[PDB]
Amino acid sequence: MLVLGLNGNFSAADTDVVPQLGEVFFHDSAASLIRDGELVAAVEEERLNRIKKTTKFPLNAVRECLALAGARPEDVDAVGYYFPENHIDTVLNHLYTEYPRAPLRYSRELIRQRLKEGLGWDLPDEKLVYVPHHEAHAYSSYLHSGMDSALVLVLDGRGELHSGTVYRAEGTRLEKLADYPVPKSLGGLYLNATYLLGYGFGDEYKVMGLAPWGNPETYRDTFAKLYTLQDNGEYELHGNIMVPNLVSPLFYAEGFRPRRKGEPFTQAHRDFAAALQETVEKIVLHILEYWAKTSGHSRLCFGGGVAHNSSLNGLILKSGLFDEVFVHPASHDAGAGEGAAYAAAASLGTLERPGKRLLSASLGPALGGREQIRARLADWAPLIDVEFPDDAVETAAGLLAEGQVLGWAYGRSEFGPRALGHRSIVADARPEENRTRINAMVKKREGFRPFAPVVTAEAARDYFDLSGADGNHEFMSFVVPVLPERRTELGAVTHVDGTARVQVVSAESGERFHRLVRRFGELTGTPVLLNTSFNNNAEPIVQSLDDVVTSFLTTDLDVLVVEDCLVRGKASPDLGVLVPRFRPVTRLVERRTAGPDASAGAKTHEIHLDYDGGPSAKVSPELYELLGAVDGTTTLGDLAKTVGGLSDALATEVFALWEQRFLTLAPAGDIGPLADDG
């Protein structure tokens, strides 16, 4: 019994189903494989096509999952899609009425055309099962908790008909207790408010990160006008007929005006974020007080995108309403795609469930066999120096105690938004200066947000208040208070309110990463490390080896530890050996605008990525001529000869383009088909 789980839209690599398809129309594409009850493989498509939260069809993800399970496509017994057919097809129909040139292809035809053309897989109609969206979430959240029964709460932006659902789960039976209609969406409320802060979809975690810097009483009475707590765990959100945003009209009427790009955060912005977060907490705790009493249950599984609010999840932990609480590492739509697999298996015969509780998100493709990895690092030789220590973990620990900031890349990639010891950036958690050091120089982001600690299972309670209920801390789902005595020790990983989004690593969740943090603590007396995702501002978490090396060379990390190899950037690296390739979404443009006196105006040359919200950059006329000659095999140095050679100016310009990921730059060939190891 081998079941594929799908979520996301149906766009190909190089175009969208309709032009410039909105980034919110079925985002976080991913594929998932279950074999007789167990999650064998799962990767988000963003990791492979390199587009954060991509809406594109997850064809690569499916190919990666089949190969990790050793299956032909024809081996698959059923496919499950995370939304009911009529719902996705009605949304597609609406996109088609606004773009009258798009052919009328709905999801069943589009799903099958992608699999037939991209994999040779001739999918029979009887194997495609569409699933209720919150049902998908709930299966994913509950079947991996290792619980025998629980109250299941699902809260996201919206499914087909609801923005919230409550389930009782027992064995493998889901039974629905309640729902909340779409207009009441807390996902929607959060995202609306995020727009007022100059941010957009996928920046909610930044808003949550900013809220401790703010005072929730400044705008408490303002938000009070937008919601009402009612009896029996009901609430209303108060809409308006002005604009499709719950929050902006009222706040505009009181003089709040939204933040501009590159504007610093004011005290009003900080307070807004605090009051926003206190509202969502206040409402979600109101739902849960009622359903914990009405159902009498002591265990909670919380799912949906709202369940990536670490701050909310810690408040639930310390509320005293439950004894255990579980949150899946991928509680957003990528997990609904996994849960769609289980629901398809229950729809089609019997449903087999996971053995025990999920401890490791390490479910993606791996970096490769050590023969490949050594061979590939040799292709990168003109840019890197590479050692092979006897104990990489042992070496890496000392480096961290010395003060180095490390890239840590091992095994299969983490499913979901958190890096957990497989695609991480690692450094000592004690120096409070490491925040501005890493959160600016090396990775290039915003410094108001503290970093996440990783602690050992053994010393965990000697640093953090993991009390209240028993939550799962293997995936950083809960923000917990840092013990006030240890707060000054942990300067890099403690917020202004004293809390921290803690990963607790054990020998069962991650042996190599546990040895690393333990060793470091034996050498320092502090078995806590800082743990952030291995990616710069312009990419999702890195996936392939080439991904990892690219990201290391284009950031300011000291050392890279990748599958026991130590990697440092050479004296002066030879960019000219890198072979430039276009990404499927790369576009290279010469533009004329209108000019004064109705003339042909300013000639500019630009590179950009063709997808909604994609970046763009001006280029010089020489880069334009060089880039246009890119054939996907010739190296940068050889292409540079048609414009006079790779000068330092050109190579600096190309390097800045590489940083922003407008095109692939990597040595000739590739690592080859990923190894089989056991």
Next chain:
Amino acid sequence: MLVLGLNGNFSAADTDVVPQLGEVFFHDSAASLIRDGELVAAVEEERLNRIKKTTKFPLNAVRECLALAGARPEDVDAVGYYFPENHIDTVLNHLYTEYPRAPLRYSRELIRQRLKEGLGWDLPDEKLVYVPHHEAHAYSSYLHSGMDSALVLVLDGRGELHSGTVYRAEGTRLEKLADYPVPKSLGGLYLNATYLLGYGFGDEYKVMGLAPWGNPETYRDTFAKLYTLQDNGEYELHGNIMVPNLVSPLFYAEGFRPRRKGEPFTQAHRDFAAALQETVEKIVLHILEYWAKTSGHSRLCFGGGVAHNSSLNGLILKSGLFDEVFVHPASHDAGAGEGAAYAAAASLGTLERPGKRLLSASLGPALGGREQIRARLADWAPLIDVEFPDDAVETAAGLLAEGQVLGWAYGRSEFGPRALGHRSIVADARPEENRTRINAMVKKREGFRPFAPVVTAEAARDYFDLSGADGNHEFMSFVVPVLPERRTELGAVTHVDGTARVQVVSAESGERFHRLVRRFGELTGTPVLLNTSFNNNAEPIVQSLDDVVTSFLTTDLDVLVVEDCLVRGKASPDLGVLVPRFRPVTRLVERRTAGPDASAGAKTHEIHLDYDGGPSAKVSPELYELLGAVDGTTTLGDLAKTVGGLSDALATEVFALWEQRFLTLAPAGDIGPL
């Protein structure tokens, strides 16, 4: 007392307040000037920037309006805006949250910046009055009716808070009687349905022209699921939570598939249109039947964008609910902008009103004087031959009787979407083949589209069934039955259901157009002409003399009659003498996508217009280099030298760009001030 009426958004000529601002965010930009209660000038900005239903700020319209009034900006006592200040600023604020680079500039600052940079006009805060949207509609509709009391009904998509308002008007007082909220919008429903036929905003009257070919029975019971008539003039529309469109989810579920662009109009499409049209008629007539007997008024003024549904109007006329109906020639948001002036004059002092019913929509800029028009037609000499007959109207009537299709350009242009003998294309209304060919060869549009007749006042009741209430027909507001014994005689202008959207012209509404129609009837026996708007499918109604000539040369019209000059195309027109100039929205692009094996794809070259829903076109490498050298003064012939001469392939390719209006092609210089 000189008051400016404003409506539209606040974008400059070459950019929008946010990038790719949607075509429905405050469309139909226009400016109106009232003086002593008389409407002395009014023009839609679309006529001047050549962007159909544009949202961009009506800067050029204000300037043209002051010129027509002989006024300076300092002469203006007040400016009205057709929406309340909090509403437009809240919507601006929404767009800004979605585009964090846009500076926070709200409407008052943007109106003042536009008037100051564009006209040297420091408008004071105390002179800018914002107006409730349906109040602005009602004033415009009612004050031009000639009536001293009426029921005034305003239906559009939405004002600030309502989709419909009902008023009582007595003297110059408006008294609100009722309103319908925004989610009951009938204009919203019509637009929603329109999107299912492969059309978009601005195409609603094509759907209404398609309706008569359909059977409203097929989908009556489906549309019945989307509304409920309730007691005492109330109704409900039934929404959904799936998509922001009220019609498509239910129709998808029943197997209806949205038409694609370029695909034929199937019978299911025609039936859908007919049902939609019947639905709106049943609702509006339900509203009107109630409010006619409740308010006691025998006279109705109908305004708001929905009042441009000629078929609905013809039904209101035949319903017997009223003795008199008036519809304004611009009942859509440009009329609201005019009404905003009346409402601002009433906020600051007393309201002076028109003394007569509006008979003529001829309210925009003219073509120019006698000698500046002769001189500018001479600049077109390499492309046109020109005759000056003793009696142009007499000559044009004979040409029409010999089967010629004429362009007709006289005087000040029509305010509102209809052409009424000032920017018209006309032909014999009798042969049914004229409908087939003017649809296929001239206007280049769908075969099912009807053509509107113009008839003299004296003969109207010989051809059309005007019976029922007395409505105003100077502006083609009412669809009326063509009398049964005349349908064969009027083959081109009788729609499939025996109706015509008729213009009754008189010596008082349009003396010269009336003379043309009267003389044609003396020559032929039929004082009726086909009268369609003078524009190809790429442009709004032609405004200026250059516009007229350009449109004439790029559509297949036989003869152009413009201000008593007979204009024909030369056998071999010399395009090389024309000076290419970019429009402010014109954009040239050389583009590479990805290609096989992650290579740079092959180059392509595009010209496009930079606005939401703007067209684009592929161009050759040679033409792409030629347009790169455009400087606004060099001729196309000299420009072509740098790619080896204006070959026939280039002239042909440029001609097709010109026909789609991607750039301006016209002789060196211009006509000058008028």
